[PDB]
Amino acid sequence: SADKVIDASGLTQQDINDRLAITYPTAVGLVGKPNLKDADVIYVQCYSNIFDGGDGYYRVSADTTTVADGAYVIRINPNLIATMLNTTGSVDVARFGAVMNADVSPFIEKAFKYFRDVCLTKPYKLNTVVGIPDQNNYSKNVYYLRGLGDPEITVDCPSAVFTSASAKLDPTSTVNKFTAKIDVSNISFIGTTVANSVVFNGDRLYNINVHHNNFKGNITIFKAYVKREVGRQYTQSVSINHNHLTGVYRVIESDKSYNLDFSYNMCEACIGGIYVGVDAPWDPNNISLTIHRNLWEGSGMLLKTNGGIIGGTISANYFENNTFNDAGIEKCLISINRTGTGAGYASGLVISGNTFSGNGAIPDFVDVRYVNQSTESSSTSKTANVKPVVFIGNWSNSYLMTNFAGALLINNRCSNRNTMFNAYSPQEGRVTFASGYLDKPLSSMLSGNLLNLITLDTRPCFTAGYINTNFKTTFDVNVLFKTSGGINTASCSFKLDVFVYTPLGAGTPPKSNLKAVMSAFMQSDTNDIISTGVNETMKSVIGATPTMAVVNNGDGTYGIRLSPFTNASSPNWGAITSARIEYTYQGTLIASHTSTYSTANLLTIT
Amino acid sequence: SADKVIDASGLTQQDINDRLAITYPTAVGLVGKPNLKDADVIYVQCYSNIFDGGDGYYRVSADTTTVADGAYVIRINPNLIATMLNTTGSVDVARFGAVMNADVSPFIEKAFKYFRDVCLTKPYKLNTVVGIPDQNNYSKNVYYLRGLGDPEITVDCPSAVFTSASAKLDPTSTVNKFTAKIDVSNISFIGTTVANSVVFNGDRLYNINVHHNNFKGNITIFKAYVKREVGRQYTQSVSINHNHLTGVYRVIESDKSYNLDFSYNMCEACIGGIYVGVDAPWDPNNISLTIHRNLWEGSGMLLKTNGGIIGGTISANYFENNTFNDAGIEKCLISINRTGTGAGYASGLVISGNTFSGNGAIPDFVDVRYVNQSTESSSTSKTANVKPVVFIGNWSNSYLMTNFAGALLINNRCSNRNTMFNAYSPQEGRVTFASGYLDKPLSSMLSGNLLNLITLDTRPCFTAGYINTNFKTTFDVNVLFKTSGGINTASCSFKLDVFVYTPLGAGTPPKSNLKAVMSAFMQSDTNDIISTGVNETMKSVIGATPTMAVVNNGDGTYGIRLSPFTNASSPNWGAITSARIEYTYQGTLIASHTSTYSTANLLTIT
Amino acid sequence: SADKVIDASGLTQQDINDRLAITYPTAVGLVGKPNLKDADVIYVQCYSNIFDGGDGYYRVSADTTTVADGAYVIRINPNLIATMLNTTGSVDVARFGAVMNADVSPFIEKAFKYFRDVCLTKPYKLNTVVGIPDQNNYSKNVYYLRGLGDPEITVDCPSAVFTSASAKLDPTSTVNKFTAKIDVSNISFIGTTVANSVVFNGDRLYNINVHHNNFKGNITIFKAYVKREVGRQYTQSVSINHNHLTGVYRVIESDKSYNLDFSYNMCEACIGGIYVGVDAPWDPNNISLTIHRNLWEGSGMLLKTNGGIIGGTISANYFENNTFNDAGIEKCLISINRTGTGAGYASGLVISGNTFSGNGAIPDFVDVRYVNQSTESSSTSKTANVKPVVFIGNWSNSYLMTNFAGALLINNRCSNRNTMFNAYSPQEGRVTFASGYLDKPLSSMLSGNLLNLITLDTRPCFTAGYINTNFKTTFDVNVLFKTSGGINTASCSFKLDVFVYTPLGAGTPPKSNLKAVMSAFMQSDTNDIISTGVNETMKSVIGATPTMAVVNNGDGTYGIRLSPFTNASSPNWGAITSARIEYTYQGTLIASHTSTYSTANLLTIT
């Protein structure tokens, strides 16, 4: 007996025996084993071979009934089994029989059937299709697949590796055999042949967050296969963010794409990017498309369609030296066309803060080809069924940023801006606009038949820079004259051109000066009716030959006086007592003897 | 004795004994134990029950003095204790006594008191309030709470589960009882009753990054409770990014919100989103608000306020089919109002690249209701105390995108654009603007009393498309005439209307042609003073009836010649020798016989 | 013998012996050891001291030849060694001999030589330079360095801690001694002296994602050192996102920076931010620069340059109370200057949705100083070699947002907007623009010598609000007259001013009314040539004194009738049969008796 025995501690060999664990070499080695009971917890030092790991706890229970898959439940003998206990929360795929440098695909498939978080720590190959437990985009759960150790996964499979459990069974059902809610992280995927390097199935994976991974050589990250939406393939709620990419064949290949994201990636020497609605365009062919904050350098075309893009953001990217593959052929980094049966216009697309450089190798690189987007055949500017791209605060030193005149350009630095038909903003072209109103008792305006309508005051202009105080202004002035009861019995309107000047090159002058010309005088008359019932007309308060004088008030303010004014009265409503004066002006901002602009903003109307 | 014994190795049973570890079943089982000494390191196979895990190392020390909490320090006997050793860096909550499917709340509270990274690997329930060690937003540290295994956490608590250690003690102090710097990740939170499913306390948690989690059923992710800032609740520096969301009752409920982020989430069939300043609006009621790059589909209202939003970005989102709950009632996805005591205007809000679709079910869906934002009562356009939303390159097929005329619209694709009073840009309405200057020795201009002022050159127009070379241009020309010493003794200004035409439908014509009309001629005169001291005036250099001729130079260039010009001289300064010519034009861009625009950009002024 | 012995189980002490693991205390303790064979797998309970951890598996092999580093391979004796087995995938640095509160730098250097994922779980100090295995930005691999337990790392090193293996050897080579592809996460870095707290080397680390960490006290996150690009240092593809920051001395210090990102950080009481091209500016000195969605509060200057920024986004940030350090000196949060040899202009910079508040302490805070950016010396507005910043839907209550008049302002809420020379948009200043065309058989227009050119229709205006139906419109109308064979034999052009008025303050009137004035009439004449060959001219179809009448059609529609019209015919081509009518208008939108705008958008041209 053992208690009789004495360890060199001075301890009973029994009192040792008690502080001791059941440990076996291999998981698969449990089948043999005697001398194990229900409630026994055992520690297996690896699954198969040690260089492959797979270590973890089992629990032995008394089990007659339940069949045994061969990893999660192992039959020790006819009436005893071991079930796998997960400790680390996330589970090595090794624990399921995954072997270093082999096809890990059956093993990932196996593991996900028992667990939701599953992790690779060893180099593997993916040669077969992984199906993934089916759940909808309303599910309680999120399948994770994690990288610890930066596992180097070689991709080599005739299909897209990853699919739904269901669709793996019928890979071709045009029935929506989909799985959602997946997170893939911290893995270096490594490609083989182009044809064999497709990682995810777009037909089949929705709501997938692919983040902080690494892709290398001839990988296609997502492919679509089956025509399933009026003759089109589609993908849905795919997001690729914070990955490195190198040599990548395609970021995504599909007919259509819903809700696709490509953010904060670092992509070197890739072949191609987002090829969507290329062969088979559609009217909406990308519906939400985000390309934010990537590096994409020394590379091919980043985006290529033949169909419409809807609700697109291409922001804060860095694009250096993209003269390769399709980019060198087509001489552009983004190529938006519309051609082929189904193909629609791009609409609602913002392109901002991107850097487009070093495409110098191609003397005629266009950064963003936008072809067949004309809708100049439409007879008005007033509808917005179709709206072209707006580009904003980008920077390009390529030959052209874009070739479509109807692209809206807002403060883009670009070569050959004065080649391009695109509209210049009033801001670039140093033009400003203001508007306001005055309400004025007539009492205060009327002098004989002179209506002292408005004062222009150039003191704010002078104050702020007498040099800058040289500008032309053009005003629309609309006057609504009102009876005491506030009935508009008379109205008139006129353009006014105003020139504000202050002599330069002799030091501070006494003041600024002002001239004005009126034109395009119009007013209400007795043919314009207020009430047919009680027989009431509008009137004409200005007489034969409208006359405007500029009154020089000698300190930098100017009255605009309007002549022959006559009051008219209604039996009902009385005479006019007051006027509402609505002014809208545009001013010249150039002030070419300074560093800055003209004081036109500061011209005051009282 | 043991060395006498012989294992079937041919090894001394003592030489075995030596390569062996102290292992016990349970952590709580250490209390009993004899035959343990100071420096002893022991391996416990689980805390309580095995199905719950909790396994890790202890160290036994000789300890008389220190009291024992019951997990981190366990009393083996009066003079011996075991302290917990953390290996995995992040610590299972199991190791503290957390049990599968129970309230994990005491256990999370316990663990965080000893460790900063704490991790859930087992399904649990949260039924009680977790307080969290108090630290300020200037702290050395970041509390993490991690998900391994996608743990399914059921939320069922009459308060917001997570709070500050302090505020858990007085849940109502209007004193700022806050904790900052928290990271929560990789967990599926699962809701019960609406009333019981609030996860985080906004009053109490600042600087919290909630990322790559999952929320399901009637969760409110954040609630605010106590009025604490002039009658308002507030939250601060909350960020929710890369989560899935499904059935979510509210993303956030509060009076006010500082610095709140909602990025790259995937949200299906949610009830409601960001309800802020709804019951109790305020003037700033959301101060920084980011809603970037989410999926939000088949859902309720995404954002609803009654107070002002300040510094808002709603970008690159995909919004399909949001006709539910409050969205179906109020017939909008975002509902910005101003009403109720305190309520202010929205100001500084950019909404770009969003996709707003399939709200067809409600024939009169408005995407963004913006109600009571009028400030048209203000008498000028010149102040920016209040500034409305700018919408830019979005896409909507809803009945209206918005209902406020003062929203700025830049290249949004939307239905009924010609319903809406919003200003059309000069770019949409095919108008362009340019400006420049010439400096010219008079010597080169003056011929008799003809001032050959400027040349217009339509060769650049013709070169680039003789068809497109049909446009009207309107120029403001300001001329500052200067003495040799560069004193501005004379100035004049005029409008010029220029029509550029090239006959179509007969092949390439010899050239483009040009006509012009001058108007709104004004000039300086002797009443405008340069120096009162030395008695110096401005002059008038153009005589009775200003006359402009267009000179046809026969090759596509045109002189603009100004008539009666007479020099004037100052005793001091001499005659005029040179002029500075400042031009500002606007041109028509429509060119309705082509696909493109008019050559107006390319008209050259020399 | 052992099988003779009997454990209190009733089990043969041999049948125990068999279910048992080889366990030693310490890794370093293996050297002594006898009684171990090839294939033996052993479990070491810590590396050195237990409080430091380091526990993991070795494998014993028979080894004569290979030398032993002292952690990964340990010599047990002349012909036996132990190699380290990695289980957890990511490897504790402890396993390499890292000790609590010491310089972990040699140990990180050691570990990365064997593994790519390496993790800190214990407080340490970084006192020496860590070199990092050299790989290019096209590499199969990504070095990770992880945080578990929120390890508190003190930084205290006379160089930047982290560098390339190569550059650690020659720290000064102007040769491009770089390493790429690194991920650093979940660590609290803690600073000492400013001079000693630099974490990463910009010269040497490319493609580095620094995310979800914590920085505290006098840390400089990145420094550049060596002049290496035409007298400049540079950094490349650095991204700092989702960190906390507190007390941070500099986010980045460099001459130049390529492709730099600063996203979703939470930064409190920092000293300074992105100091780039300060001492030594350059023409492009930041090439791609993203500052998105940070908190930056109670802090110093966030960005400071003296060189050009190219392709910049500063979006959705919250900036409260930034009155400190350099911010209080220079009285600004961003300070973009151009000065010192090499220095260029900022170009292509979008600043949107930021919140700039509580800088009240400095009565004259400018949020974004933009100094020496004038390029008003350029003679046209038409080139875009240089383009200034565009600011859009930000919010500021600082004294000024910016001080450069040439910044483009789009719907920014800001103080003193009517101080600033920046152009007001036509939209703010309540101006709208539309354009279209009509094609019309002359047959339908011509009546005697009256050309009934176009109808204006104010019914759409009235329908939508008879109060708002008071506006001035100014139209450019260009008419291209065409022979049956569609040859443009005649053309004319005119301005038209149109006043649309409807009397207010008496209930719904019968209709809206309309007046118009024509001006700036021009037409083709026989001097304009179609074909010199076959001797063909353009003609004049309007006679002595062009006359336009407004025809009141009595229901809210108005003909514009043009007078003396005469047909002209070509021998070749016949008479004119049809005209193409191109209209471009601008309208006043103010409608100061309502909450909204004028109906000008809805005026219809048929």
What is the rounded CA–CA span in Å between residue A26 and residue A43? Answer: 9
Spell out which residues of chain B touch residue A428, defining contact as CB-CB under 8 Å: 433
Cα gap A577→B435, rounded to integer Å: 44
A292, A381, A408: residue with CB nearest B410: A408
SS3 C109: helix
Q: Residues, chain B, total?
A: 606
> Which residue of chain C comes nearest to A215, CA vs CA?
C140
Which tokens sit at A227?
């025509």
Length of chain A: 606
Q: Are C441 and C450 in contact (CB under 8 A)?
A: no
Count CA atoms closer than 13 A to A407's CA, side-chain side: 26
SS3 B472: strand
Place of tokens 């169909």: A307
Q: Give the residue from chain C lying closest to A41, CA to CA.
A: C19
Beta-carbon separation of B292 and C242 below 8 A: no
Tokens of B401: 């995108």
**Experimental structure resolution, Å:** 2.6
Name the token pair of A293.
């904050």
Provide the token pair at C486: 């569609």
**C59 and C129, same structural domain?**
no
Considering Cα of C554, then C559, then C565, then C569, what sign does the dihedral take? negative
- Give the Å distances, CA to CA, from B542 to B451, B572, B576, C146, C489: 10, 22, 13, 80, 37
Residues A107 and A156 in one domain: yes
Name the nearest CA neighbour of C92 among C103, C106, C107, C102.
C107
The 3-state secondary structure of A74-107 reads EEEECCEEEEEECCCCCEECHHHCCCCCCECHHH
The residue ranges of DSSP E strands in B159-271, in sequence order, are 162-164, 179-185, 188-190, 198-201, 205-211, 214-216, 220-223, 236-241, 244-246, 250-254, 257-263, 266-268
The chains in contact with chain C, meaning 3 or more Cβ pairs closer than 8 Å, are: A, B
Q: How far apart are the first and last CA of chain C?
A: 114
Dihedral angle, C-alpha A461, A467, A468, A473, nearest 10 °: 70
The rounded distance, in Å, linking the Cα atoms of A445 and A123 is 90
Residues C114 and C90: their CA atoms lie apart, in Å, by: 11
Of A429, A444, A462, which residue is a domain's last?
A429
- Residue A117 touches chain C, beta carbons under 8 Å: no
| Candidates B214, B413, B591; nearest CB to A142 | B214
Q: Could you tell me if C342 and C281 are in contact, meaning their C-beta atoms sit under 8 angstroms apart? A: yes
Both tokens of residue A378?
A: 């439409």
Shared-domain flag, residues C101 and C70: no
Are B496 and B595 within one domain? yes
What is the tally of structural domains in chain A?
Answer: 3
Q: Give chain C's length.
A: 606
Do C265 and C405 lie in one domain? The reply is: yes
CA distance C317 to C299: 14
Quick one: C301 and C324 in the same domain? Answer: yes
Q: How many CA atoms are closer than 13 Å to the CA of A321, on its beta-carbon side?
A: 7
Tokens of B109: 């509270």
- What is the full DSSP assignment across B334-392? EEE---STT----EEEEEES-EEE--TTSTT-EEEEE-S---TTSSBSS--SS---EEE
Is residue B374 located within the same domain as residue B485?
no
Strands (E), A509-573: 513-523, 529-531, 536-537, 542-552, 557-565, 569-570
Residue C508: CB partners within 8 Å, gap ≥ 6? C466
Question: In a 3-state reduction of DSSP, which class is residue A234?
Answer: coil
Task: Kindly tell me the sign of the dihedral angle through the C-alpha atoms of A342, A343, A344, A349.
Answer: positive
CA atoms of A165 and A197, how far apart (whole Å): 20
Method: X-ray
Q: Is there a single domain that holds both residue C587 and residue C463?
A: yes
Residue contact B584–A513, C-beta within 8 A:
no
Q: CA B292, CA B262: separation in Å to the nearest integer?
A: 6
Given a contact cutoff of 8 angstroms between Cβ atoms, the answer to whether A298 and A327 are in contact is no
Last residue of a domain, one of B374, B407, B429: B429
Please write down the HEC assignment for all residues of B506-560. Answer: CCCCCCCEEEEEEEEEEECCCCCEEECCCCEECECCEEEEEEEEEEECCCCEEEE
Domain check: are C241 and C362 in the same one?
A: yes
Give which of A491, A480, C592 is closest to B379, Cα–Cα.
C592
Contacts of B65 (CB under 8 A, 6+ apart): none
Answer for the pair B316, B352: CB distance below 8 angstroms, yes or no: yes
| H-state helical runs in B42-128 | 105-114
**B581 in reach of chain C (CB within 8 A):** no
Interface subset of A 13-42, CB within 8 angstroms of C: 13-14, 17, 20-25, 34-35, 42
Based on the fold, state whether residues C518 and C508 are members of the same structural domain: yes
Separation CA A76–CA A83 (nearest Å): 10
List CB contacts (< 8 A) between A503 and chain B: 487-489, 491, 524, 528, 530, 538
The Cα C172–Cα B591 span in angstroms is: 61
Amino acid identity of residue C111, one-letter, is A
Q: Which of B299, B595, B599 to mutate to test the interface with A (most CBs of A within 10 A)?
A: B595
Question: ∠ at Cα C505 (C503, C511), nearest 5°?
Answer: 35
Residue B513, both tokens: 């042609």
Lookup result for tokens 């002024």? B605
DSSP-based three-state secondary structure for A21: coil
Q: Looking at the structure, do residues B291 and B166 belong to the same domain, yes or no?
A: yes
CB atoms C53 and B87 under 8 Å: yes
* Local structure of C561: helix, strand or coil: strand
The last residue of one of the domains, among B59, B88, B117, is B88
Nearest CB neighbour to C381, from listed A212, A424, A436: A424
Report phi then psi at C574, rounded to 5.
Answer: 80, -165
Distance, in Å, from the CA atom of B196 to the CA atom of C158, rounded to the nearest integer, reads 54
* Residues in chain B closer than 8 A to A183 (CB atoms): 212
Residue type for position C146: R
The residues with which C581 forms a beta bridge, in sequence order, are C438, C479
**Residue B143 sits at the chain C interface (C-beta within 8 Å):** yes
Give which of C121, C145, C126, C119 is closest to C53, Cα–Cα. Answer: C121
What's the domain range around A306?
Answer: 89-429
- Tell me how many degrees the CA angle B348-B349-B352 measures, rounded to the nearest 5: 140
Phi, psi dihedrals of residue A451, rounded to the nearest 5°: -100, 105
Q: How far is Cα B575 from Cα B582, in angstroms, rounded to an integer?
A: 21
CA distance C194 to chain A (A): 30
Q: Which of residues 299-338 of B touch C (CB under 8 A)?
A: 310-313, 315
- Nearest residue, CB atoms, B394 vs list A85, A117, A311: A311
| Spatial separation of the C-alpha atoms in residues A517 and A473, rounded to whole Å | 11
Question: Are A307 and A286 spatial neighbours (Cβ–Cβ below 8 Å)?
Answer: yes
Query: Which of B:404-433 have CB within 8 Å of C?
Result: 405-406, 408, 410, 418, 420-426, 428-431, 433
Q: Any CB–CB contact under 8 A between A3 and chain C?
A: yes
Contact B20 C23 (CB under 8 A): yes
A85 touches C at CB < 8 Å: no
Mutating which of C395, C437, C589, C599 best tests the B interface, going by the most B Cβ atoms within 10 A?
C395
Which of C17, C55, C602 is opposite residue B16, by nearest beta carbon? C17
Q: Are the C-beta atoms of B118 and B86 separated by less than 8 Å?
A: no
Going by the DSSP 8-state scheme, the letter that residue C444 receives in this structure is G
How would you classify the pairing of strands A446-447 and A450-457?
A: antiparallel
Of C148, C356, C584, the CB nearest to B430: C584
Beta bridge partners of A237: none
Find the residue in B nearest to A430 (Cα).
B435
Alpha carbons B289 and B277: distance in angstroms, whole number = 13
Would you call A35 and C11 a contact, using CB atoms and an 8 Å cutoff? yes
Q: How many C-beta neighbours within 10 Å does residue A383 have?
A: 15
Q: Which residues contact C415 (CB under 8 A, 6 or more apart)?
A: B385, C396, C397, C398, C399, C400, C401
Measured between alpha carbons, how far is B313 from C317 in angstroms, rounded to an integer?
10
Shared-domain flag, residues A34 and A126? no
List of chain A residues whose C-beta atoms are within 8 Å of the C-beta of residue C86: 53, 121, 149
What amino acid occupies position A526? T
